[PDB]
UniProtKB/Swiss-Prot annotation:
This is Protein MxiC. The lineage of its organism: Bacteria, Pseudomonadati, Pseudomonadota, Gammaproteobacteria, Enterobacterales. One of its GO terms (biological process) is protein secretion by the type III secretion system. Keywords: Plasmid, Secreted, Transport, Virulence. The gene is mxiC. It is found in: Secreted; Host cell. The keyword Secreted applies. The keyword ATP-binding does not apply. One of its GO terms (cellular component) is outer membrane.
Amino acid sequence: MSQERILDGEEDEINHKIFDLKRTLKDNLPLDRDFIDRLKRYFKDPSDQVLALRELLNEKDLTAEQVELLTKIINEIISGSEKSVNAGINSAIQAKLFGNKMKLEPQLLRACYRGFIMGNISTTDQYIEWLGNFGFNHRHTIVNFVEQSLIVDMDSEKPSCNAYEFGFVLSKLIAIKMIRTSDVIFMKKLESSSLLKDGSLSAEQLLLTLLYIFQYPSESEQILTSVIEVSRASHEDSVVYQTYLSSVNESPHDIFKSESEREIAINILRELVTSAYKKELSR
């Protein structure tokens, strides 16, 4: 129940730590001083620390009322860190589930969900972040992991957030799904345009390029410069611009700050298309 949600080390390695703390409590019956230092040394993560102490409370040898002298350690760790601790505990199983699927270290996922419900960066900055931390191939699965954890988090006896906060989280989640939606669309356009066949252009770099457009529509042209310096060797400008324009048109509207911001992006990309298609006549 508690040992399974510990994401620090191998199954035996974990067990080699719990019993020692049970040892310093049952047959030795010593005091609690450097005990905490050893606990923290064994487990660097507060969630894993609490889980270890909870397992200690599952032993048969109740030495009477030292339960309160042990639960004070549980509450001292939790107090003032209720959000982080609970976020780690509740999403542990999912971290192990998705970790095996994606071939990623579970505790990395715990940090992911932890940071998501505790941070306050924009929707686009989040997508970008997850991209850089977990890679191109995991970008759609990572959002699924966060969703699954949120569901479990909510159904937990001691959730990480309150009713109000979970609403905001969801709202952020939906914003992310919209980005994933445009991402999926953008990728389909790249395939049909045959911009990935050459092998010179990176779909990750192109994805980020689209993401920058969302944040700074006024600087669209400047942003696309990086792509042009590579696409010119094989493809024609109008083709790259069309991919971005048609993608933006078919993507959800609320990805942009506002209606006017979106039109700034569209008009600029519209002008870019015309200009390139014109220069293609003098060739």
